[PDB]
């Protein structure tokens, strides 16, 4: 509808504010990968597990580069 597109406005804004936060801390995730991580964070998920798996998978795309 309209107010659910105004909710789409309040999510498109936050997805850019976190994109500023992502580059001043210079994480390797681009907007596409961060788009999977924000949906995960909505469901409730341990960042102490997720950061270990991201530091594992980034250690395997520079080992198979």
């Amino acid at each position: 509808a309209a107010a659910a597109a105004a909710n789409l406005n309040a999510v498109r804004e936050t997805m850019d504010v976190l994109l500023e936060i992502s580059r001043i801390l210079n994480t390797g995730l681009d907007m596409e990968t961060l788009s999977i991580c924000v949906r995960l964070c909505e469901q409730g998920i341990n960042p102490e597990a997720l950061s270990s798996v991201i530091k594992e998978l980034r250690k395997a795309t520079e080992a198979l580069k």
């Binding site: 597109a5 789409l8 309040a10 999510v11 498109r12 949906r39």
Partner: peptide, 23 residues
């Protein structure tokens, strides 16, 4: 789903009669 729909479009005009991010 929400970031699929996130890439929607909006108009260039911004309202002088609505404040709070008018699209």
């Amino acid at each position: 789903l929400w970031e699929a729909a996130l890439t929607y479009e909006a108009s260039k005009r911004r309202c002088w009669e609505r404040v709070g991010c008018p699209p």
